[PDB]
Amino acid sequence: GVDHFRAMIVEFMASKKMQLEFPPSLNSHDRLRVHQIAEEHGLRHDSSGEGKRRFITVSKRA
């Protein structure tokens, strides 16, 4: 995949903030990766945004 995302999600996991909004710019494989890391962990991965400013959100189940 792209390990850059994993390291971001790992910070977010260790930090256990609340949610993290990743950009729409994830082509396919990158979005699928954010989903997969989230699914492997305890994160609710979903898409968010109203108009052409869509994004990917992952939420930390504390």
Swiss-Prot record:
5' to 3' helicase that unwinds RNA and DNA duplexes in an ATP-dependent reaction. Specific to 5'-phosphorylated single-stranded guanine-rich sequences. May play a role in RNA metabolism, ribosome biogenesis or initiation of translation. May play a role in regulation of transcription. Interacts with tRNA-Tyr. This is DNA-binding protein SMUBP-2. It is linked to Neuronopathy, distal hereditary motor, autosomal recessive 1: A form of distal hereditary motor neuronopathy, a heterogeneous group of neuromuscular disorders caused by selective degeneration of motor neurons in the anterior horn of the spinal cord, without sensory deficit in the posterior horn. The overall clinical picture consists of a classical distal muscular atrophy syndrome in the legs without clinical sensory loss. The disease starts with weakness and wasting of distal muscles of the anterior tibial and peroneal compartments of the legs. Homooligomer. Interacts with RUVBL1. Interacts with RUVBL2. Interacts with GTF3C1. Interacts with ABT1. Interacts with ribosomes. The lineage of its organism: Eukaryota, Metazoa, Chordata, Craniata, Vertebrata. Belongs to the DNA2/NAM7 helicase family. Residues 1-62 form the R3H domain. The R3H domain recognizes phosphorylated 5'-ends of single-stranded nucleic acids which promotes binding of nucleic acids and stimulates ATPase activity. The chain holds residues 725 to 786 of 993 of the full protein. Coiled coil: none annotated. Expressed in all tissues examined. Expressed in the developing and adult human brain, with highest expression in the cerebellum. Moderately expressed in fibroblasts. It is found in: Nucleus; Cytoplasm; Cell projection, Axon. It comes from Homo sapiens (Human). It comes from the Eukaryota.
